[PDB]
Design a protein around this ligand. Structure first.
Ligand SMILES: *[C@@H]1O[C@H](CO)[C@@H](O)[C@H](O)[C@H]1NC(C)=O
Lengths: 47, 50
């Protein structure tokens, strides 16, 4: 269930205290047990 | 079910296909063939007094 918005919040640590709803985006029929989650980051080259 | 099928102005979100009323009875539907919003109204009825 995802949702994207533009936000102009001044404090990055502070998620906005505004009501919002997350529509059902996608469903996956596979039932593989999952225990742990790793965020994936994009990091290209020295600049 | 049995009823009168009409076009409905209620907007369904893309995932939504069915609509329900206060009584938790189906009030609107999305046609399986063409994705369109149709509401169902029961056929006309009324008490008869002599
Ligand atoms: C078959 O089903 C799809 C999904 O509703 C629909 O878009 C398509 O038009 C249908 N085929 C015909 C010939 O109507």
């Amino acid at each position: 269930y995802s949702k994207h918005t533009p936000i102009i919040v001044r404090e990055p640590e502070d998620l906005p205290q505004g009501f919002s709803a997350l529509e059902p985006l996608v469903d996956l029929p596979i039932g593989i047990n999952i225990t742990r989650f790793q965020t994936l980051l994009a990091l290209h080259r020295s600049y | 079910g049995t009823g009168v099928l009409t076009e409905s102005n209620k907007k369904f979100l893309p995932f939504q296909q069915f609509g329900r009323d206060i009584a938790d009875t189906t009030d609107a539907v999305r046609d399986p063939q063409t994705l369109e919003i149709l509401d169902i109204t029961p056929c006309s009825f009324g008490g008869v007094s002599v």
